[PDB]
């Protein structure tokens, strides 16, 4: 949040010595997928925790279960009852009104 690519690139030159403040600024300024809760695309074989956000087909899903889970091959967001999404609830509701 603090710095840009052109500011971070300014600390790593050809004749300088390393220091811990450079890595502190490097770690704080990029996105930590564990601490900010965002993992990108769903993959089987991972482990997730309560609150994680994941993109599966055309929707973002938040995990509801409070204990860690192993992402199983044949359990996928939409099939299981761990995950949740609003773009599907609202989709079905509007489909219902359209049909009615």
């Amino acid at each position: 949040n603090l710095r840009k690519r052109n500011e971070l690139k300014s600390l790593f030159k050809n004749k300088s010595r390393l220091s811990e403040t450079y890595f502190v600024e490097l770690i704080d300024s990029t996105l930590n997928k564990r601490d900010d809760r965002f993992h990108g695309i769903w993959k089987p074989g991972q482990t997730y925790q309560k609150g994680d956000v994941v993109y599966y087909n055309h929707s973002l899903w938040e995990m509801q279960s409070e204990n860690e889970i192993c992402a199983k091959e044949e359990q996928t967001p939409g099939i299981s009852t761990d995950w949740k999404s609003l773009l599907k609830e609202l989709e079905q509701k509007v489909d219902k009104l359209q049909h009615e």
Binding site: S16, R17, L18
Partner: protein, 48 residues
């Protein structure tokens, strides 16, 4: 002047030839820099 060779029966000097040994080698080549980025292996950066 005309150039010729050295001989142990016209002078008392010869050509000096000895054997080169690999394990007894010493290098004479100093590093231009040390301890900074771009000049050391990743194992040797101490994060000063």
């Amino acid at each position: 002047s005309v150039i010729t060779s050295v001989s142990p029966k016209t002078s008392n000097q010869d050509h000096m030839i000895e054997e080169f040994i690999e394990q007894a080698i010493v290098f004479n080549n100093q590093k231009l820099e040390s301890g900074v980025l771009g000049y050391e292996s990743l194992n040797d950066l101490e994060l000063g």
